[PDB]
Design an enzyme around this catalytic site. Structure first.
Site, mmCIF file in Angstrom:
data_model
loop_
_atom_site.group_PDB
_atom_site.id
_atom_site.type_symbol
_atom_site.label_atom_id
_atom_site.label_comp_id
_atom_site.label_asym_id
_atom_site.label_seq_id
_atom_site.Cartn_x
_atom_site.Cartn_y
_atom_site.Cartn_z
ATOM 1 N N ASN D 375 44.618 22.996 -39.269
ATOM 2 C CA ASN D 375 45.380 21.811 -38.921
ATOM 3 C C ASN D 375 46.716 21.809 -39.659
ATOM 4 O O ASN D 375 47.107 22.794 -40.293
ATOM 5 C CB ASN D 375 44.560 20.554 -39.219
ATOM 6 C CG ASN D 375 44.344 20.335 -40.699
ATOM 7 O OD1 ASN D 375 43.989 21.258 -41.429
ATOM 8 N ND2 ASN D 375 44.556 19.107 -41.150
ATOM 9 N N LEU D 376 47.436 20.691 -39.567
ATOM 10 C CA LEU D 376 48.738 20.571 -40.209
ATOM 11 C C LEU D 376 48.638 20.603 -41.730
ATOM 12 O O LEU D 376 49.602 21.000 -42.394
ATOM 13 C CB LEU D 376 49.422 19.283 -39.743
ATOM 14 C CG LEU D 376 50.762 18.871 -40.356
ATOM 15 C CD1 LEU D 376 51.871 19.818 -39.936
ATOM 16 C CD2 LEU D 376 51.097 17.444 -39.968
ATOM 17 N N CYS D 377 47.500 20.208 -42.294
ATOM 18 C CA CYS D 377 47.279 20.275 -43.729
ATOM 19 C C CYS D 377 46.405 21.455 -44.133
ATOM 20 O O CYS D 377 46.074 21.585 -45.316
ATOM 21 C CB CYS D 377 46.659 18.968 -44.230
ATOM 22 S SG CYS D 377 47.526 17.477 -43.691
ATOM 23 N N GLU D 379 43.260 22.267 -43.799
ATOM 24 C CA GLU D 379 41.932 22.022 -44.340
ATOM 25 C C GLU D 379 40.869 21.831 -43.270
ATOM 26 O O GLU D 379 39.677 21.883 -43.595
ATOM 27 C CB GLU D 379 41.940 20.802 -45.277
ATOM 28 C CG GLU D 379 41.364 19.517 -44.702
ATOM 29 C CD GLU D 379 42.346 18.773 -43.828
ATOM 30 O OE1 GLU D 379 43.548 19.100 -43.876
ATOM 31 O OE2 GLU D 379 41.918 17.850 -43.106
ATOM 32 N N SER D 578 49.338 9.666 -50.020
ATOM 33 C CA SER D 578 49.783 8.358 -50.482
ATOM 34 C C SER D 578 48.648 7.377 -50.739
ATOM 35 O O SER D 578 48.832 6.440 -51.523
ATOM 36 C CB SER D 578 50.753 7.740 -49.467
ATOM 37 O OG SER D 578 52.075 8.200 -49.688
ATOM 38 N N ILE D 579 47.487 7.567 -50.109
ATOM 39 C CA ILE D 579 46.365 6.672 -50.356
ATOM 40 C C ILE D 579 45.731 6.930 -51.717
ATOM 41 O O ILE D 579 44.941 6.106 -52.195
ATOM 42 C CB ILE D 579 45.328 6.792 -49.225
ATOM 43 C CG1 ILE D 579 44.533 5.494 -49.092
ATOM 44 C CG2 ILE D 579 44.400 7.973 -49.469
ATOM 45 C CD1 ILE D 579 45.372 4.266 -48.885
#
Ligand code: ATP
Ligand code: ATP
Ligand code: TTP
Ligand code: MG
Ligand code: MG
Ligand code: MN
Ligand code: MN
Ligand code: MN
Ligand code: MN
EC number: 1.17.4.1
Lengths: 289, 683, 289, 683
Positions: D375-377, D379, D578-579
């Protein structure tokens, strides 16, 4: 009496290398011998060096010392042309015709070439010797600049013109002709400024300035002969190029208000053959017929 | 340098102070004695040639199987009996470099001119040997020329679509935008030029699901379309060509126009996307009175009225939009916008100008829809209905996307054969056949509109060539008289053929009953005004041909009322770029740009004089740039009064004239009833 | 990472004064009050005087001390625009709107004006203090240059933009908008050159350079407030002009890679309407552990 | 400057040579007693608040209608009974700036932390008051944190989608490419990051129906996707983020990489689309042996074998590809390609590195498909089947496009409460609910994969925070022992919850029977190896909690064999950007970048110390850049052995080290079993 007309001429001559598509030269380049390609690359590299220093140093420094906002505007424009237009155009040519390694090698070659280093040392030395409010040091640098514009470029210009005249490398040749058209007016303009300073002097001082100009020309000339032989012997053209540089040396002297120094000779006729819209507002009467 | 190229370049060499035009003919001979015959594949008989072409996947089996081999051989013999010879070197060069079928290795020539013409005729006739021979006689006399897609691809298995002008309506949604991008890619893959209407798209700074300042405007959609057209470039053969049309009252109109400025940034400028601007009469009235205009946010208008801004008449809606507080708008100066249009056209020739009311005051199918935009060449002007492409696993509402069928009459060849009627009817039949045989499985609205509207575009070319070879200046009133008469006859016979096809097949185009053809309004100016030539010279030009009178037009009106009309649209004058070379004709109805044009192919130079150019007609072959653009506008309006669709009308300007002159030409075109303006070519 | 990109953007923005016809401004100029005409003249002269310093000294001095052929070329191009394009454009606007005697008097007044002089001499002082091979003094001058390009001009630009946004003096307003667009990119570019120097410094030296930049900004800002009241109180605009100054001060700081100094404010809508790690080959046994 | 801003900046003003960390707490108080309490909107009771949020289109009324108002009041009272206090100013600031619900004009605060947690819990429970209270206790204790999409958008009317990441398979066709562009725009409109596998697309210079050298390669599709993501940018709020993944054996792999070179031309450079490279073990073997490798043309392989190049094992088919004359290939230097990867990652942090064999040697669903991209991250590592998007009016063959819901365990809070089991099971239930209520109407493969796979991602945060606050060095073997035990417990309880859900619903995920869960192979290392802590300190850390042994794992294996598993994938460790601020936790399982981070907001600057940073644990909060990347790789591999999907592993590099050091780190990661490498961030 002349700056305004030079201002107008310079700005109307404005151009960018990207206006000329270069992929059309790809085949006539491919077809040249290795000797011819080598001389061509080196010739343009020597030109690139001269324009680099004329743009970085020569034109800005003369602009700094010449009085009058309009004269400064012309000199600033000429400086921009040297490094933002002329010097860059050579890279456009190199990037089209040559692989990166050949480009890297030719720029390394300029750094170590003794004639090119000597001519840069001499010209830039005179630019950096200008003293504020000292018109004689300024005159000497203007003579050096005229010799760069109207004499020194020509050992380089010969070869693109020689090909252009045979219908070869005509897109690169078009760029070179635009550069040459600019340098011709740059040499005249700087020549007129030099004459202004010369004309202020006593007869005795004038005699010394002529000595300076002729000694400098001869010193540059002797170096240019060796440079010319070094580049052109492998393509068989050294004697022809030598005639061309002597021809242009006379033009440089004339730009400085001096008599020709070399005797006239027949130049290769091939090289001689090598040489927004206006807006009006809409009236209410334009909507009726 | 090859011998034919030397013989062609010998034209410019002047003997006795005159160009050696006849030398060009010799060049053709050389081009056939040295090159074409040597590299042309020959077979023992036509049966072997057809078997080799079919087996090697050059031709299609279906269209050849409709005839016995004897009929195909007879058609080929009819094609070769003319003994057609290309009169100029460039004609043969363009045909054998662009249209002649070559082997997979592209070193041998499989198709001659007669072979290609015979194959196209056999494809047109769809099994009728006599009809195929009629088509062969039509094309070998060079009276009619199928468009580049049809001429190049007819009967070939490895081919694109026969239609290359496509008009797409884009609805104001992400699903519709993505579908428009997909359809543009699919149609560029087929080899067609795609025009997209972006007026329904909401402007920049509009709301998406009631969140403010969210829309990117039409410029982001233009960037997406430009990327799609760059990607889909005919399998890396030609540069992907697309057009975007925006109404001038759309708020993005400036940013739209800003996409063509040289100073525009890389994230603003679109390079492979042509732009056209639709100018309603309201904008021209506002500019004329110098009143400040308003560019509206389309989504606010849609929310307030339930219809798109470009779907209603701006002449009656502009005041209501301005006075409506719930409609968001921005103040602009219409004269400044006109000057910006003129400046942009001077710099780059963009945008195309569509005079909406000029198109729609003579549009026969306003009941279906008003013409909101044009094609990539700015000559297709048809009713279009937007499609509602919904989410996945949800039924789409398929509208009408324009795709007309191109084909050009050669005015010189048609009129010297005194065969306006026969050529027009045969061209209409061929265009109908190509429209019926077109089936695009990735453009639903294009396919639906092709099935329903049955719209074709029958153009004309060699107008200036014909006029110059007959001692008539293009700007003369006699030239306009000839254009009026010739194109009125073309319209008459096109309508007659459409009505005859409707009677034969028993069907008209969808929603014909609401058209002005059904109500007889279309024929009004034809049943009251006589279009016979007013000059004796033009009448002598039309000698031997029956010129339809007002009684003939009344009979045609009654025939259309009784039987209907098969085609929603019949006539559109395309630019005719390269087929004009093969036909030895001047391009479209435009005046010639140069008397002799210099071209560079490979590393060689070539010279093409205009067809029939000589010392006697050198003055009559006036260049377009030297002509008065007002008289060119007058001629184009004279032709346009007999053309249901538009005419590709390129302006030819000198570098001396300013943007005021360009704006004056545009406003005179609007005044004279010009529907579209194509290009502003500056010399 | 950035010079070739800025080269492209600069050269593609090239323009000339002659492109905009100025005479049609007289049709709105005649309808302005004396205070409006007075403010406009004074603002225009202020911009002209500051831009001349940038053309004669600011850009050429930075081009002289910055290393890199491509940077020198871009900087030369920017200097050219100041001297050859901007200066002629300001002169053209003046000659169109005022008679010769009025132009001479306005320039005499603005030349003696305390607030214009204070800022002009502060900037020029920093250009004169650059020392050869001293990157700290160069950085300070670059900060001054960015403050001129991206901040000090804007108390002046306000008025032409204010008219331009109302449909008044549209021809000269178009010219001013083109000039402003050039100064914006000049400010961004010089800002990147300053950040390059800043990033080569220690943490203590960085903190010291930040203090310099903020202190300089404060001095210039307090003088801008006085300059603003002096020119704009007579036409009732000073409150809104002050918001525009702070907004542009924040842009200038961001150009220098610094945080905004002033709280975010909305701007007058009429003015808005106007507006390499070391490559080391794998040596094998790096695949085994 | 605000008072809380000054108090937060007072941290760095050292007193007696020590940072004033306690000042941070004061800041929060100020931030609440001067801004939050004044900017909050208070109602007379909860009924008025809920009614105002429902009628004003802030909340969906459906999820609130499943509870009587007494139950909702009880849930809110349970949330507020904890008296939760933000220990740092940045936690509250990040929540109330990024996640707290504000008015339409964003002038007031409608949602507190307890209100947001109560709404999310009520959405999760789906009508169960006790389950809602359990979720409230889980989130107010900050043991579990739903992902940013879920936490921000749960129960909101103006919400987007709760799924963070989407993975699309792009088939080698124009229809599939256009559909991929459309789906990417649709999912970026929904707010999710979209990853596309471009390995099936044929390379540049391939044939499109017998015309050769026609394809633009993956770079043209990359440009199209980049423009699509630029256009669909979450209504202009968050820049559209996309990822492209290409196999390293694709011929375009260099051009792919050239999209991220800082010297790339504008026609090649792509700036809003992240790039990832999938490296099979064959490439690493070839680079290790210094044998020249071959990149392949996918279309030739598909023509010869009938399957895509990335559809089969390169470790067994590479020699067949090389020896096959009908397969087209280009010679490359694998070591030079590795050095290019290292240089690109040093310059820009791209590409993502996916070690395909490391992913697929422990992948439990290889029968469905091998994991071909991330995916984009980088993982998410799940099986995907490509979709066959056909022409219009033709049925499409819908495949499986990966999509999972993210949720992170707060390791410090989970272990402090001694509630690994309860937190894991409740988080699994919440992620199952998020998957069940997710229905995307414009991505058919994503919808089908969500319905069939039922894949969820349960991550973890505050690993470094827990280790540093407990006096354990992140690089120490004790830290790796803790990670081993904790994540074995997480995997055990996630598998137990998945099997319990499968039992209670009577359904497993699609094609579970062929998975290693059904055959019992997945539990092999769990039924033979004991993962209890080897250090006394870690065992004491795990006191009060039943660490599963081999017998518990055998019982779980039998339970799975009897009942199956509801989720194909359960654990994936997202970056949690950010969370992590709101939870007062270090980002993901990565080590901290800096002890105190200086972030500029507005015109002010704020300093966020790492959670629990103090004098006694200053050196236990070692910065990631100062750490040995080999020991970080060891930690990530230790965690990865218990995670079925991947871990977003960011490399933290110093400027002094060379590309050879980066290549060594990458090769050690591949050797240690690292599945994916996220970023190469250089200090
Ligand atoms: N101008 C031309 N246009 C088209 N084809 C030409 C042209 N000139 C020559 N050819 C081709 O070359 C052939 C030779 O023509 P040529 O002028 O030598 O005499 P011919 O009597 O037409 O010959 P043939 O026996 O081939 O009919 C023609 O038949 C034709 O195929
Ligand atoms: N760090 C914090 N995190 C969350 N909310 C806070 C925080 N600090 C203050 N508040 C909010 O602001 C209010 C201010 O009250 P404060 O914490 O000063 O104590 P109080 O008035 O004695 O009451 P209590 O602590 O029992 O709420 C709190 O009741 C709470 O709603
Ligand atoms: C149409 C088109 C395709 N392509 C490439 C991208 C696709 O991955 C690939 C497949 O296109 P397809 O849509 O599959 O084309 P096709 O089905 O007509 O050809 P084939 O039978 O060989 O499959 O071609 C381009 O690069 N540019 C284009 O304009
Ligand atoms: Mg919608
Ligand atoms: Mg295909
Ligand atoms: Mn020069
Ligand atoms: Mn010069
Ligand atoms: Mn300036
Ligand atoms: Mn400037």
């Amino acid at each position: 009496d002349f700056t305004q007309m030079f201002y107008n001429q310079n700005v109307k001559q404005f151009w960018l290398p990207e206006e000329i598509a270069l992929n059309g030269d790809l085949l006539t380049w491919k077809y040249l011998g290795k000797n011819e390609q080598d001389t061509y690359m080196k010739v343009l590299a020597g030109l690139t060096l001269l324009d680099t220093e004329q743009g970085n140093t020569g034109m800005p420094i003369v602009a700094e010392h010449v009085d009058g906002h309009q004269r400064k505007a012309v000199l600033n424009f000429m400086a921009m042309m040297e490094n933002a237009v002329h010097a860059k155009s050579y890279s456009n040519i190199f990037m089209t015709l040559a692989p990166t390694e050949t480009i890297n090698e030719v720029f390394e070659w300029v750094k170590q070439n003794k004639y090119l280093q000597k001519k840069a040392q001499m010209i830039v030395g005179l630019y950096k010797a200008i003293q504020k409010d000292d018109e004689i040091s300024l005159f000497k640098a203007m003579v050096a600049s005229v010799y760069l514009e109207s004499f020194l470029f020509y050992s380089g210009f010969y070869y693109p013109l020689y090909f252009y005249g045979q219908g070869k490398l005509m897109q690169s040749g078009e760029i070179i002709n635009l550069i040459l058209r600019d340098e011709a007016i740059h040499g005249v303009y700087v020549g007129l400024l030099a004459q202004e300073i010369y004309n202020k002097q006593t007869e005795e001082k004038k005699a010394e300035l002529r000595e300076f100009a002729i000694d400098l020309l001869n010193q540059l000339y002797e170096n240019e002969l060796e440079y010319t032989e070094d580049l052109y012997d492998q393509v068989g053209l050294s004697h022809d190029v030598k005639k061309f540089i002597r021809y242009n040396a006379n033009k440089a002297l004339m730009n400085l208000g001096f008599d020709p120094y070399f005797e006239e000779e027949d130049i290769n006729p091939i090289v001689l053959n090598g040489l927004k819209a206006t807006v009006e507002p809409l009236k209410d009467d334009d909507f009726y017929f | 340098v090859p011998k034919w190229i030397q013989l062609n370049n010998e034209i410019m060499i002047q003997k006795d102070g005159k160009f050696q035009f006849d030398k060009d003919k010799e060049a053709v001979h050389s081009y056939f004695v040295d090159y074409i015959n040597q590299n042309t594949v020959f077979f023992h008989n036509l049966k072997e040639k057809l078997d080799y072409l079919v087996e090697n996947q050059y031709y299609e089996e279906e269209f050849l199987s409709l005839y016995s081999f004897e009929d195909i051989k007879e058609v080929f013999k009819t094609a070769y009996a003319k003994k057609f010879r290309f009169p100029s070197f460039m004609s043969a060069f363009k045909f054998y470099n662009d249209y002649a079928l070559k082997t997979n290795d592209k070193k041998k020539i499989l198709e001659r001119y007669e072979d290609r013409i015979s194959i196209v005729a056999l494809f047109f006739a769809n099994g009728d040997t006599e009809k195929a021979k009629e088509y062969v006689n039509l094309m070998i006399n060079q009276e009619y020329q199928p468009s580049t897609p049809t001429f190049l691809n007819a009967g070939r298995k490895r081919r694109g679509e026969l239609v290359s002008c496509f008009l797409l309506e884009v609805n104001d949604s992400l699903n519709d935008i993505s579908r428009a991008i997909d359809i543009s890619m699919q149609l560029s893959k087929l080899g067609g030029g795609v025009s997209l209407n972006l007026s329904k798209l909401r402007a920049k700074g509009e709301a998406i699901k009631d969140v403010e300042n969210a829309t990117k405007g039409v410029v982001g959609v233009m960037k997406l379309l430009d990327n799609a057209f760059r990607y889909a470039d005919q399998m890396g053969q030609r540069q992907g060509s697309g057009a975007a049309y925006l109404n001038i009252f759309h708020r993005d109109i400036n940013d739209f126009l800003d996409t063509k400025k040289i100073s525009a940034d890389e994230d603003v400028r679109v390079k492979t996307l042509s732009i056209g601007v639709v100018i309603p009469d309201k904008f021209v009235e506002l500019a004329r009175e110098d009143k400040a205009a308003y560019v509206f946010y389309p989504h606010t208008i849609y929310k307030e009225y339930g219809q798109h801004m470009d779907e209603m008449d701006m002449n009656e809606m502009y005041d209501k939009f301005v006075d409506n507080p719930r409609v968001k708008k921005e103040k602009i100066n219409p004269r400044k916008l006109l000057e910006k249009l003129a400046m942009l056209r001077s710099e780059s020739g963009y945008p195309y100008i569509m005079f909406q009311d000029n198109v729609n005051k003579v549009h026969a199918n306003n009941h279906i829809s008003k013409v909101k935009f044009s094609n990539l060449c700015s000559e297709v002007l048809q009713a279009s209905q937007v499609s509602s492409y919904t989410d996945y696993d949800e039924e789409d509402e398929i509208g009408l996307d324009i795709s007309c069928n191109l084909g050009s009459l050669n005015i010189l060849n048609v009129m010297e054969h005194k065969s306006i009627e026969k050529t027009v009817k045969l061209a209409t039949d061929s265009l109908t056949h190509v429209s019926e045989t077109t089936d695009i499985r990735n453009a639903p609205a294009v396919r639906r509109a092709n099935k329903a509207m049955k719209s074709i575009g029958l153009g004309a070319m060699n107008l200036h060539g014909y006029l110059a070879q007959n001692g008539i200046a293009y700007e003369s009133p006699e030239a306009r008289d000839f254009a009026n008469t010739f194109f009125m006859m073309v319209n008459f016979y096109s309508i007659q053929r459409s009505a005859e096809i409707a009677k034969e097949k028993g069907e008209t185009f969808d929603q014909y009953e609401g058209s002005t053809y059904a109500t007889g309004e279309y024929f009004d100016k034809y049943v009251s005004t006589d279009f016979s030539p007013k000059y004796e010279k033009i009448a002598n030009l039309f000698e031997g041909m029956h010129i339809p009178t007002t009684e003939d037009w009344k009979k045609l009106k009654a025939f259309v009322a009784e039987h209907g009309m098969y085609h929603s649209y019949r006539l559109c004058i395309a630019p005719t770029g390269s087929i004009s070379y093969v036909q030895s004709s001047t391009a479209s109805v435009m005046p010639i740009m140069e008397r002799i044009e210099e071209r560079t192919y490979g590393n060689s130079k070539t010279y093409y004089p205009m067809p029939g150019l000589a010392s006697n007609n050198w003055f009559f072959y006036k260049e377009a740039y030297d002509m008065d653009m007002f008289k060119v506008v007058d001629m184009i309006a004279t032709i346009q009064q007999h053309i249901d669709q538009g005419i590709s009308f390129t302006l030819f300007l000198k570098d001396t004239m300013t943007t005021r002159d360009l704006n004056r030409i545009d406003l005179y075109a609007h005044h004279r009833g010009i529907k579209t303006i194509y290009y502003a070519r500056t010399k």
